Every structure is written in structure tokens, then in C-alpha cells.
Amino acid sequence: RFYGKIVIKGKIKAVTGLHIGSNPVIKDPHTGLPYIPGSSLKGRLRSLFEILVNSRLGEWREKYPSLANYSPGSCRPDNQENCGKFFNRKINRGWIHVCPDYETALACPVCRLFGASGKESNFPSRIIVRDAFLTKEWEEKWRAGEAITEAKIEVGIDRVTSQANPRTNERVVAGAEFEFEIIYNVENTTHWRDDIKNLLTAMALLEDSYLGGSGSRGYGKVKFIFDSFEFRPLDYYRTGKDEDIVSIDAREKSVSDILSGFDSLFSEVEGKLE
Amino acid sequence: PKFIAVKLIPKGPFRDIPRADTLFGAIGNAISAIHGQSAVEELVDAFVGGARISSAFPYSGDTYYLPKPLSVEPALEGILTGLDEEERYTTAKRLRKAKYLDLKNFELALRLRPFTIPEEIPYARVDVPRVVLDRVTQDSSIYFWEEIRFREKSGVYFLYSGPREVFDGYIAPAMRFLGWGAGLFEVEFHEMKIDAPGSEYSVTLSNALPTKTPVLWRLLRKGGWSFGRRKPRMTFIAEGSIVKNDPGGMERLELGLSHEVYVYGLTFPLGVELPEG
Amino acid sequence: MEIDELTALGGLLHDIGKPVQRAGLYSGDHSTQGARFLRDLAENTGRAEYELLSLFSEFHHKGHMKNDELMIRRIKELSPERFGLTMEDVLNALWIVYEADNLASGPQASRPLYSVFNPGKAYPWAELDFEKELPVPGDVFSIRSQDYRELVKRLWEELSKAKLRSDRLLPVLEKYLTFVSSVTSEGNIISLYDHMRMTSAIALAMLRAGCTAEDVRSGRCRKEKRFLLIEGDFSGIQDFIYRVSGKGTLKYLRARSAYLELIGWDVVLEILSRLGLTRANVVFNAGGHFMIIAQNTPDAVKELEEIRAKAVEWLYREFESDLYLAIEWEPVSGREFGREGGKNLFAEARKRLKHKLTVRKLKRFGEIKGLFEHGHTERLAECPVCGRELPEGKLEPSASDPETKVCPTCNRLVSLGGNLPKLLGFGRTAKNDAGVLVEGPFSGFVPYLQGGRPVGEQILVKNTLNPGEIPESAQFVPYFVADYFKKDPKGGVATFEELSMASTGTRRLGVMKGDVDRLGEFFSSMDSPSKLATASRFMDYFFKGYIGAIIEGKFGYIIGDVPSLRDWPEEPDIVVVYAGGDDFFIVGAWDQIFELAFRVRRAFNAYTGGKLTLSVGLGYFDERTPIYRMADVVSERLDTAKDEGRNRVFVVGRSRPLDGKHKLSYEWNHYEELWRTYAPRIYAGNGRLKGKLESKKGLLWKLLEIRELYVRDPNDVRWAYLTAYLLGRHGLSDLFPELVGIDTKAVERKEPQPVYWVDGVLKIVLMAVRR
Numbered sequence A: 001r002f003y004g005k006i007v008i009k010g011k012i013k014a015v016t017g018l019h020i021g022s023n024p025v026i027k028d029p030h031t032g033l034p035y036i037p038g039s040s041l042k043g044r045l046r047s048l049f050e051i052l053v054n055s056r057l058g059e060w061r062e063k064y065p066s067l068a069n070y071s072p073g074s075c076r077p078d079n080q081e082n083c084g085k086f087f088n089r090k091i092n093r094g095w096i097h098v099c100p101d102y103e104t105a106l107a108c109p110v111c112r113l114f115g116a117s118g119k120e121s122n123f124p125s126r127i128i129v130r131d132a133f134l135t136k137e138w139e140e141k142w143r144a145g146e147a148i149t150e151a152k153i154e155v156g157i158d159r160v161t162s163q164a165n166p167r168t169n170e171r172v173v174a175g176a177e178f179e180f181e182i183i184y185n186v187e188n189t190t191h192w193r194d195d196i197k198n199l200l201t202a203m204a205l206l207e208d209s210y211l212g213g214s215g216s217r218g219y220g221k222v223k224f225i226f227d228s229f230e231f232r233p234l235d236y237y238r239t240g241k242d243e244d245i246v247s248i249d250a251r252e253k254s255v256s257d258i259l260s261g262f263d264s265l266f267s268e269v270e271g272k273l274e
Numbered sequence B: 001p002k003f004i005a006v007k008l009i010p011k012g013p014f015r016d017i018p019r020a021d022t023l024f025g026a027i028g029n030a031i032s033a034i035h036g037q038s039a040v041e042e043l044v045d046a047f048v049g050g051a052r053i054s055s056a057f058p059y060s061g062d063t064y065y066l067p068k069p070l071s072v073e074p075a076l077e078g079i080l081t082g083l084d085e086e087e088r089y090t091t092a093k094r095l096r097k098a099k100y101l102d103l104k105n106f107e108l109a110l111r112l113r114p115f116t117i118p119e120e121i122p123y124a125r126v127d128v129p130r131v132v133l134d135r136v137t138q139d140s141s142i143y144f145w146e147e148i149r150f151r152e153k154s155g156v157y158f159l160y161s162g163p164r165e166v167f168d169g170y171i172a173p174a175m176r177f178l179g180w181g182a183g184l185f186e187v188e189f190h191e192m193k194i195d196a197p198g199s200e201y202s203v204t205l206s207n208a209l210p211t212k213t214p215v216l217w218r219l220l221r222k223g224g225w226s227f228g229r230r231k232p233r234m235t236f237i238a239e240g241s242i243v244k245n246d247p248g249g250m251e252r253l254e255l256g257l258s259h260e261v262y263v264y265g266l267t268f269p270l271g272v273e274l275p276e277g
Numbered sequence C: 001m002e003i004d005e006l007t008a009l010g011g012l013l014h015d016i017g018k019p020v021q022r023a024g025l026y027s028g029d030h031s032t033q034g035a036r037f038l039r040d041l042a043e044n045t046g047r048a049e050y051e052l053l054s055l056f057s058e059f060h061h062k063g064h065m066k067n068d069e070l071m072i073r074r075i076k077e078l079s080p081e082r083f084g085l086t087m088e089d090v091l092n093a094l095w096i097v098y099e100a101d102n103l104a105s106g107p108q109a110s111r112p113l114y115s116v117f118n119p120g121k122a123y124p125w126a127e128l129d130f131e132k133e134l135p136v137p138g139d140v141f142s143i144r145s146q147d148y149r150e151l152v153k154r155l156w157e158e159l160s161k162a163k164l165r166s167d168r169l170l171p172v173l174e175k176y177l178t179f180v181s182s183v184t185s186e187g188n189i190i191s192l193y194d195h196m197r198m199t200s201a202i203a204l205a206m207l208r209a210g211c212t213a214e215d216v217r218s219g220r221c222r223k224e225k226r227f228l229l230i231e232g233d234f235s236g237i238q239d240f241i242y243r244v245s246g247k248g249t250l251k252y253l254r255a256r257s258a259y260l261e262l263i264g265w266d267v268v269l270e271i272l273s274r275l276g277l278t279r280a281n282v283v284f285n286a287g288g289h290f291m292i293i294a295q296n297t298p299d300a301v302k303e304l305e306e307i308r309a310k311a312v313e314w315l316y317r318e319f320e321s322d323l324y325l326a327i328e329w330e331p332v333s334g335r336e337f338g339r340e341g342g343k344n345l346f347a348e349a350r351k352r353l354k355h356k357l358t359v360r361k362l363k364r365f366g367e368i369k370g371l372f373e374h375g376h377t378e379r380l381a382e383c384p385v386c387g388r389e390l391p392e393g394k395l396e397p398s399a400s401d402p403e404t405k406v407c408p409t410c411n412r413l414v415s416l417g418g419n420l421p422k423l424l425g426f427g428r429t430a431k432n433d434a435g436v437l438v439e440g441p442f443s444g445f446v447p448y449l450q451g452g453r454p455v456g457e458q459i460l461v462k463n464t465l466n467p468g469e470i471p472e473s474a475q476f477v478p479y480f481v482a483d484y485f486k487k488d489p490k491g492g493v494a495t496f497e498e499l500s501m502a503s504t505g506t507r508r509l510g511v512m513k514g515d516v517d518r519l520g521e522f523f524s525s526m527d528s529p530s531k532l533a534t535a536s537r538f539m540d541y542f543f544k545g546y547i548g549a550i551i552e553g554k555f556g557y558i559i560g561d562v563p564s565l566r567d568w569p570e571e572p573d574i575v576v577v578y579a580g581g582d583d584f585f586i587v588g589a590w591d592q593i594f595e596l597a598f599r600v601r602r603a604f605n606a607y608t609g610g611k612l613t614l615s616v617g618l619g620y621f622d623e624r625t626p627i628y629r630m631a632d633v634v635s636e637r638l639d640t641a642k643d644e645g646r647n648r649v650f651v652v653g654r655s656r657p658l659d660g661k662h663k664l665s666y667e668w669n670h671y672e673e674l675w676r677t678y679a680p681r682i683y684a685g686n687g688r689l690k691g692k693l694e695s696k697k698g699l700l701w702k703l704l705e706i707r708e709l710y711v712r713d714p715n716d717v718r719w720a721y722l723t724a725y726l727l728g729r730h731g732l733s734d735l736f737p738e739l740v741g742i743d744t745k746a747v748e749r750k751e752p753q754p755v756y757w758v759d760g761v762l763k764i765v766l767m768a769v770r771r
């Protein structure tokens, strides 16, 4: 079935800039602008969430029942796939979490919200992280110059000669809204509440950890100011003149949006529910 | 022929230009999502059996680009006699980099007239070196997986030569259903006109699976996993060649799933008068 | 010796008297001196067929065809029934070779050969030894007759031990008579060897036509359409050598590049041996394009249709639709081989055949009875290495980590690459013999290594003309390949990770892809088979034999000051992937790829005398970048430098505005001027910056940040100001006098500003001294 496509639309302010690299330079597609690639947003948004359930696997264990045969760890000591520690998927050097079957990944709370592949599994990610693309304040700011990037130089200071060395970084300018969006499929309506609560949990792991490259020394510190929770149930596509949910927008802090107004926002979408 | 167009305003990168059959796959999954399980292309069999999809280029402005009438490649030197005797090399601009043309250089790129090639092509086939990360530690693993990237005001479109009842019943709801990030999609309908002379032999405007009738045609090979098990190679005519000895090359049933996937390739005409052959 | 073994030699030695005549051995014409040179050679090798070839030397300074009743007297005095011939069966072939010499084209002795590209300049006499100093067209010098005498003596040395068949007389005369002038006249750009080749070709075609002296003496053979121009194009070469994923290494790429030329030579040799024609009936075979002058019977068309259907079906079954062969023939007349009535009948016939070839290459794979059919088979999976991409489970994992299943073609090809340094040649045998490594459309190949002795009646020997240690049963077929590659510590082919470690600067891989410019128009201007043969063979010898000379460090006396990123070493880090026909594609370390581009361009500017040019795209990638992206980048870059001025290099992908005034490419006289201007001021040798910019090495990085303002808008004027704001802060007042003041000279004629062009000189230094 399909009763889906929730649109979280918003703006992400990089309070100290970003360094989604590619001198290391930011991703610059066709106009010279930078942009958050939606790959990096989904990727960091799953690393934080996967390490959250790595800590919390032994205690949920009844909710999300397929996340019980793991017993936390990485399978880098015993160099094999399918080892029950938490996560195998040896790509070239790394070890990420992907459930190796569809029947399991209908229940793993990380894996059923960003998908599964490998051999004979093929789970779709249930989410579409649109690349964020520099909302129209900073586009018109860019047209008169304003230097949308910022070359920032660090050094490797020694302690026996106290020498140094240029390691330039060229990060995005601190303070820039990016027109952030999230599209989410709402298959399996009984999963949905905990699912978007989990996505908001992973987004709330951001604003307190690093996006974008050489973090933990600056360079991250992003802020989602997301305006419009929407809905596109089954009548926005066969029609679309009217009849879709538009939620409250202005000052929705994500550490307060997560439940202190969410069930006041959930129950309107319970009004359609079909 | 007053066939309408569907302009797809992107918001970012695509994986590839959708190759005139992958839309009919995507239309199939769209009407598989909406309308239950039996209003899907089994029900739309006799409705695409008189109406075609036939994808084409981006536009870069509003200039709706169109691929090539491939019946100018034989007698290109018969076209460009008006130029000076250094016309060869403009033929190499109109043979080797012959990719896409403006409409005004397409109503007369056929019908044996001296067209002019454009150069404002909205391609950035860039080499985006994506993801490298392990959940605990380093990962080196630069795996490329390049994608296409557009201009500032551009976007793909495609055509529709069919009755508008069938358009607004299946495809036009589906063209707003489509809107990892590369599915960036805003739909804006339109109409269009093409001069299109007498219909002896003329263009297909799609990727094409013909009924055994070869006339001056680039060959293609299109894979496609299409719900898991790898689809076969399914040799195709490329975008815009000339098979008009009464086409109607039917869609091909496949195997691998519970319900069959069946691949597009049925074409719709235009107007060309080709020199000889 | 039958009539064809007589005729193909008599068309090959009908002008053998001209190197003897200008060397001073006897008196008379070039006819009697050649027969007098030959008439002692029959008493040397014992075979009395050389005395019979003296009759084919006995044609010119004519009026002997009024003396024809005395010509039967001179024939009967040699008894041609000693080899199974009659009088008229020799006389007919004599008149055939007389007619054929008039179908090769429409004074002072020492006049040299004029070069085919610039008809003014000329070569000294040299030898086709690619491990030596190689000719360049210089000013018009009289060829010293003692060098002709040394040529005659070495011909006497190398004609006795050579066999009396065409397969040995072809490379022996090609080694010595290549650069000798055929006709000593001004503007004669026709080689002696190519005139001999086309004469033997047209003579064997007219012998297999059925025309005799009853038809030659009437002058009817020029009007009767008794010939066939058979051209064949390999369409899809770029999608065959290069569509290779990241698992494919450089050994496998060079193996595919050899494999394509092997398939081409198999089709050419099958058309040669199924018609009855020697290697003289091939005008050129290069770049997958070949042209054959053949006879015109109702059955030869049937043989060609059988060959075409066979080769196209083998290509479609083996490599699904990624390598098509278009073999189209046009029945031409003898009138269409010359310049008659002012117009160019040969170029018009070739243009008609090329139009038929383009019509064919549109209808690609037009002869497959089940091409467009349904009902595809089961259990199909593409291999990761090739894009052959439709076997069944036949594909076999080997020659690597044996868990990745792999097609048998690329199973054989890495094994070919493991023998590729020590390979001496191939042997064209039947497809089901011992040691058959690769197949073809008709014939398998046995890799002739450094000790073996294979035979399949044809031996494809690489890069040489001396056959040496191969038996006297097989047909010795030479073929040239630009072969140079950096050997590893073992001796094998270095990979990309083995090559880019020798990069003076950043670790990046340099990839170069070129083309000769406006060459298709250059071959619609030659109005003889002789001129086409010379103008194709001299072009192909550059991109198949000269490349290994320029990479090895030779030709320094005319190359001179190219952009020198470093010292040019003894063994470069340069691996030639595929150089042939016109184009050339070379990977390696980028610091030597860069120098190789300008070395190739300036040596080619010397080699054609400036009448031709070459476009070159360049690219720098990571060592782990897939080769198909590594070729699709430089193909787009070569096409962009092709479109925007036709004679231009693409050094590095730069940012530009969108107005049509800023061109991405570079003229060579622009870029070499710029590297003569801005590089020795700011860059020292061997990866170290200049002593003024020492310890202030972040200065040149700031100029690109300056130049980005000019990139974002051309009309503003901030760039020339902030350049002086940078250069004043470090004292370097003089290093950029062009960048500080906006030049009115460029804005007069709507040319871009002088800060647009300097960054292509900056970044290549910035990649050179990065760490």
C-alpha cells in the first residue's frame, strides 16, 4: 500500500558553517553556490541514530523485535559478515548497519527508516532527504558579492620545535539558511508515529553534534527551524486543489517540537488517518 | 498534431535523463501505488495502445529542445550547399555533437532545410565523489556514483500525444506523485505545436522496440533491475530515429516477479521527408 | 609460380629500376637498368622467376608496344613454360601491369621526395627503423647518389635471403624505398613504395578481373567498371576500449586495445585471402578503418557478402552491440582513379563510398535475422570487468581474487597482458588449435612469444619488418603498434597506482586524448590511390611508430622548450593505451603526461610542416577513478576543444562565464607563450617554487580567489585592483604586470581579460608544488 509522503520543509542555519568537502572545497554544482548534499544529511542522520540504537538495543528489545539478535559490538574483530554483534556490511573498509533480509528489516528501527540491501533483501529507505539549496535570502545576498564561502586556516603546532603548517579548509560562512526539506513515505501506518518520532530524535541528535566534515572543533552546529509539516494522503495526487494538513511554523524548536507540541500536531493527522 | 507537453521543474540532480521507458516504469509504480492493484497498466494497456509518452530533453529557459531527426545524417551535404566550401566541419558539429536542437531548428531540421545547432545545453554530468564512512571509525572507499546536474532555470520535459481524458486519469496525477535525494520534481503542464510534414517516414521521439523494421537507427541497450531481479538487455532504438513503415511495436512482457513487468517501446510519429534510402 | 604470384610481383617490381637508375649501375632508361639489375639475381637465389620479372621491368619508355612482335621474341627466349605458363598468359599480365601503372597516377636524378602535407619541404633519405632518428620534412636538399648506392647494395644484401613471394618483397622494399621519390618532379608527393603497392594491387585486381591485352590495348579497361573500393569502419571503438569499470586495470585496457586491432587485422586478412589478394591490396588499415582495392566479379561480391555477414554475426554474438563493422564496397571504374576533366573523380568516388558508409553506419547491425526478437534466455548476469554484459553462467572467476565471476574474454585478456611485455607477435590460425588465446570473426590467434614457432599460414609480427625466426610457410604480415609502457620492478605493466606514485606534486593520474585536425577534408584532396596511400601511411607511422620515439626522449633537436614540469627521465611513467590512425590516448603520471602533450604537438607541427594541427584533451583524476569516466571526461574535453577553435589544447577544467566570449580551450601558440611568460618567473625546476615565492607559497592560491570575481562577472573591474592589493603586500611588484592594469587591447576586439588565461598556467604549478 501507500498512504504517504510527509513533507518536512524547513531552513537549516549553520551557526558556525559547514565543510561538506569534495584545498578541500565544498560541493559546488553549477552556479558556484554551495549546498548540503542530501546524501550527507541522511548519512549523518543515520550514524547518530544507529549509534543511539547501538547503545539502546538491549533494552528496547520488545518494541522492534528484530533488533534482539545483535548484542552490541562491531564485527571488525571477527572479520565476517552476518556476525551477531550489531552491524556487518563490509564495504571497502567500513562497517555499517544493514539488515540482510526484508523480513527482519520490517522491524529494525534504524534499518526500516533508511532501508536495506545486499543479497535478496532490497528494502526501500522510506525517506527522501532532498538536498538543501540556499534559500532566497542568501541567493540575493550572493548576487552582490558577499563571499558565501570562507577560507579558514588551521595548523599542526608541534611542541619540540613549535613549528606549524598551513591546512586550509574553505568552509561555508557562519550563518546561512539552506532551505532544508525531508520527504517521508508513510507505508505501514502502525509504524508511523514511532518512525517520525525516531526521525525527529535523529534530527535532535543534530544541533548537538557535528554535521559536515571536520567537526568537533567548530564547523558543525546546525539548527533546523522547520516550518511546515505537511501531508499528502491519497487525495493530493488524484486531486490537489485543497485538503492537506499545514502545521504551525514560526519558532518550532526541535528539542521542543519532538513531543511538547507533537501530539497536538499528530492528532490533526489522526483526523485523516487513511 | 497538438500534442501536449509536461514540463518537470527539478529542484536538483537527477540520476539520468529518464530514457523514454523508465518513465513508463515509473508511471507503472505510480498507478500501482494509487488506484489499487488492477487499475495499473494492465488496465492502461489499450489506453497506451493509442497514446504515447516518448521522452526528450530539458529546455534551459523555455526553448523546448528536441533530439534529432536522424534522417539528415545521410544527406547532410545535400542540406548545407548554401554555405561556403568550409562547410564540412559544421557537418561535424551536426553529426558528432548532434545531440539536441531547438524547435525552430527542428521544424526545419527535418523537411530538408539548413538548421543550426544549439550550444546552451543544460548538462553538468559531474563526477560527485560521494560517501566514505564507517559507523565507528575511518572509511576510505571513495565510490563515485556520478549523477547529472542542471542549470539555473532548466528542466526535463516530455510529450503526450493522447486524449486528455486518459492523460488526466493516469499520467497527470502520477506526474505529481514523483515529487539519496535525486527525485527533485515539480510538475507544470503545457501545450506545444510541431509543424510535422507528410507521414511517409518520420521520427519515433522515444526509445523504441520496433517490429523488425530497420531504417537508419541508433541501437541501444537498456538494463534495469525493476523490483529486484535484473531485467534483460532488450535492444532498443535510441532517442529519435525513423521507423515509419507502420510501427506499433508492442510492449514486451518479461519474467521474474509475481505480476509481470512489461517494458515500453511503442512509438509515435512526426513528419519527415528523408532524401533516399 | 602461377600467374598471380607472377603478377603481384611484376606489379611490385615494375618501378624497381628507379633506385638503381639514380645510383648509377648501368645506362639507358629506368626500365632496362632494372631488368639488368634483376638478371643477375636469378642466378643468385637460383630461381629463374627473377629473369621472368625482368620482363615486367621491360615496359616503360614505350613504343615497345609497337615492337610487340619483338616482345614475344624476348619472352620466348626465356621459356615461360618452365613454370607452367604460355606466351599470351605472360603477355596479358604484362599489359595488365602497364595499364595498372597508368592507374596509379595521371628530369634531374637527385631530386628528393616531397612531403605529402607541406609540399615544399622534403626528407633526406632514411630508413623505416623506428629505433633510430626519424625523418622530419626539411628544406629541399639534393639526395646524395652514394646513399642511393648504399641503398642498392643493402637491397642486394636483403633481396637474396628474402623469399620470392610478396610477403617478403613487401617489407624489404618498405624498409628502404619508403622515403625515396617515385617520380623526380616538383610537387610529387607520391612514394615509390606506395606507387609499387598500388601498382601491384591494381594489377592483381585486373588479373582477377578477366581483362587481357585485347581489352588493355583498346583502352577499354579504364571505362569498364573493373574494380571495387571496399572500405570498412569500426564504429563503436570508444565504447569498446573504454567502457570498463574500476576492476579493470591498465593491463586489461592495453589488452583490449591490442585485441581490437587483432580483430581488424583478422577481417582485413580474411578479405585478402578469400579474394586472392596480397598485402599490397590494402591502401590503409588504421584506427579500425581500412580501404581495399579489389577486383569486380559477380562472385567477389558474393564472397564479400559472406565475409560481411560472418564478421557482423560474430561481432553481434560476441560483443553485443558495442563494436560494429561497416564494410561497404563501391564499384569504381578505371576512369575514377585519376584527375580527368579538371574535377577530382577519385575524391568524388571516395565521397560517394563514404556517403554509403555513413548510410550503413546509421543502419547499424542491419543483417541479424533475430536482432529485434523477444524470448530472451535465462540466467543472465553482467561481469564487473567487461561490459560484455550478456553471458549465461558461462563466466568464470580466475586471474584475480577468485570470488568475482568474470567473462572468458577478460579471462584471456589479462593472460594476454601477462605476456604483453614479452610478446613478439601473434599467429593467425584456425580457432580450434593449440595455444589459441583469443578468437576473431574467422581465425584464432596464438601468441608468438620469444621462443616459440607458431604457424597458421599468417604471422602478425609487431613493430618490425625483419621476419627472422619464423618459417617459410606462413605469410609474414607486419603490423605497427605504439607499444611504450613503464615496466614495473618485475617487467610487467604498471597499474595506475603504480604509475601515479611518480607524480612530482599531487597524487593524480594524467590522461591525454588527441586527434588530428580536419583530416577528413585532407583525404578528399588527394586525387590518386598513390597519394592516398602515401598520405595515410605517413600519417599512421606517426601515431604508431613515432610516439615511442618521442616518449623515449628522442627528437629533442626540434621540440625544445615545451612546458617542463620536471626533468624528462630515462624511463618515463608513460603508458600508451591506444595510438593509431589519427588519434592517440595515453595515460600515466600527470607531470609527464603534461610534457608529452606539448612534445607530441610540437613534433607533429614539425612533422607535417605546419599544414596540419592536432587537438589534445587532458585530464587529471584520482588513481581509483573508473576508466570509463576517465575516458568520458577527456572525450568531452576533446570535443569542447574541437568545437571552439579546432586546434586547441584543454589543459585543465576552468571556471568561465556564460557569454560565448570565454573559450575553455587554449591555442598552443597561446599556452606555450604563457608558459614561456609566467612560469620561469614564478616556478623553478623539479617541484620547488621560485626563491622569491619561497616561504610565501600561499600567494598563488589567492590569485584564483581574485580570478573568481572576474569569473562571476566580466563587466566589473575589482579583479585588476585586488591583484595589485595582493602583490603590493608581498613586495612582488613585477611578477604580474598584465594582471594589475586592465588592458584595453583585449576589450577592443572583445577578447577576454589577461587574468582569465593565467590560471591555466597557475594551477599546473599549484599541482606541482602541493606538498
Ligand SMILES: Nc1ncnc2c1ncn2[C@@H]1O[C@H](COP(=O)(O)OP(=O)(O)OP(=O)(O)O)[C@@H](O)[C@H]1O
Binding pocket: B092, C284, C286, C287, C289, C515, C516, C517, C518, C519, C520, C521, C522, C523, C535, C536, C537, C539, C540, C580, C581, C582, C583
Ligand atoms: N591514419 C589514417 N589513415 C587513413 N585515414 C584515416 C587515418 N586516421 C583517420 N582517418 C580517417 O579519418 C576519418 C575520421 O577522422 P576525423 O573525424 O578525426 O577527421 P577530421 O577531419 O579530423 O574530423 P574532426 O575534425 O571532426 O575530427 C575516418 O573516416 C578515417 O578513415
